[PDB]
Design a binder for these strands. Sequence first.
RNA 1: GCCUGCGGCUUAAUUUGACUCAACACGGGAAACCUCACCCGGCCCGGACACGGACAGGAUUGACAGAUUGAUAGCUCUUUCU
Lengths: 72, 95, 123, 55, 55, 166
Amino acid sequence: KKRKKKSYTTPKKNKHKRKKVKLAVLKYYKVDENGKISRLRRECPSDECGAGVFMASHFDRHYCGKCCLTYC
Amino acid sequence: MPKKNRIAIYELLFKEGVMVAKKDVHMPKHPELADKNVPNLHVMKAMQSLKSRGYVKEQFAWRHFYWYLTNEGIQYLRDYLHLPPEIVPATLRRS
Amino acid sequence: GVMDVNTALQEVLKTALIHDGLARGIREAAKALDKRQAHLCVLASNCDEPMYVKLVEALCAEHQINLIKVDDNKKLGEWVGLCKIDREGKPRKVVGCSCVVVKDYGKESQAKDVIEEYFKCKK
Amino acid sequence: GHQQLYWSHPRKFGQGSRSCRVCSNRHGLIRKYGLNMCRQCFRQYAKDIGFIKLD
Amino acid sequence: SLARAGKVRGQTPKVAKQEKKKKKTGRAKRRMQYNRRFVNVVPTFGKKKGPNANS
Amino acid sequence: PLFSQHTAADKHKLQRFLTADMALVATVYAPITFPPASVLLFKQKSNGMHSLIATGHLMSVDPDRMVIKRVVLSGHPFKIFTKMAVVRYMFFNREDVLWFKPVELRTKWGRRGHIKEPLGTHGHMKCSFDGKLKSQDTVLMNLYKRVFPKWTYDPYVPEPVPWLKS
RNA sequence: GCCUGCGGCUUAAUUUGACUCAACACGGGAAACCUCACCCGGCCCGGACACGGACAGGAUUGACAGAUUGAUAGCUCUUUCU
């Protein structure tokens, strides 16, 4: 047997290049004149992401990045 | 691999001189790395990483890789974990 | 007090990588020192973002973390250790970090001597 | 990857989950008495395992 | 009907000549031919190796 | 001009570039002169220096001498069975293969074949051959058209400046 | 009459070797998947290594929801978190 090549569909399905939000650590904290630190987003009730890892502010919900826990 | 997995493999080598494998892609975990939770897919290719540099020796027989520590392979693992030159591996010990 | 003032920080950072506590960068260095587990911190002086210096030092002294100062972003990453070396030992390539968080010390009477006295008279 | 469908098809029963222990082949296999070798790789090690062609 | 003229000369990749150090001439060359054959004799059991013999 | 193979046959293969050692036939509409006659070729370089590129002579003058432009289309044999193989990247439609069905294939390693069925909606084809193909191979078909030169004749040619070297 | 092998012919593919004894219940070939090479649609990287580029003010990794998608396929997109 010899090979049919067959290299054709709706041409490509290219992958996701990773999102570069520059200095997004500055987004979470907000420091006022005295040093006031109001934490804008949520701390997870889990064990591995408690007191060190923060959560997500989408438009109506919560979505943790480590343990993938979802609220609304 | 994550860096938790990289440094489990290197502990059992410098103690002994030997790391073995099954050549299983479907494997959940390797049995020597017990309660250390490294898939046996990860034991292979880090041990494939040190061949092309010249550190581990392949000599394959019946679906199970064998590996040794090179004389230049001895000094490589002492810089990573910082073991001192006060401690020997199991090579220079017996008799 | 044999090690000099900024010189005594060379012995400190070698010992933690025996036990893997130096989390480098901007993002983990805040959070892993929020974690009520680590000892101290340093911020570099060569730093370009105005929103950078605001957030870092405010979390420190509230959670009882004292700050030392070394100048460069090139300097405080060679203690983090990202920089590659040549065949003869030259620091060939530099990618330095402007933040360090130390969690576990080693046991060195050279490192612990000089830097802890710097903090008492500051109080 | 990823982990949920990388090797997900169940390699239980059937000759897709039996290999020769010598040459990792899945055809022509002898699994009697717990050999688990191929029928050609048996004939190399037939005497070294200890089988004798008596008649 | 067939018949090219110098096909094989024009199909060969034109490899440029290497630059080596010059050869000694005359008495100097003969000297080197003498010492390569009778002076630094290397012992062999039956002598089956030639001078140009590449493998 | 149109450069060509200098052959004894009726068909002459076009040469797309002028080679440093080959003897070639330049074919052009010019007012008929009688052989023998010498023929020189120059090219306007820069600042009006005529540069001698090619020397020769006048051969027979006739329009009947057909110059043929060839096109060699490469393909890839990716599935190989004995004496019949599957080629891709030579065509891209289906009826592209169906158009060039009676075109006899050849092969870089010297196999002489011809297409059978087209299979894909993309350009894939089953092809028979004389022997079995190497996988290291490249399939290729030869297409030909007759090409005649451009009508660019002006008897006026500018006076060159004195020639010098670079 | 049927069981299976070969050709032959339709088929996206109905893989392939074998052609007088010395091919044709043969390839331990009784293949639902697997085996699987064949065809269709998708995934992954399992590209070791040396050097250059980038990269710590993060290179990169993992991803609920909803659309799409056969697929609780972060595969792509929004969503912004690790």
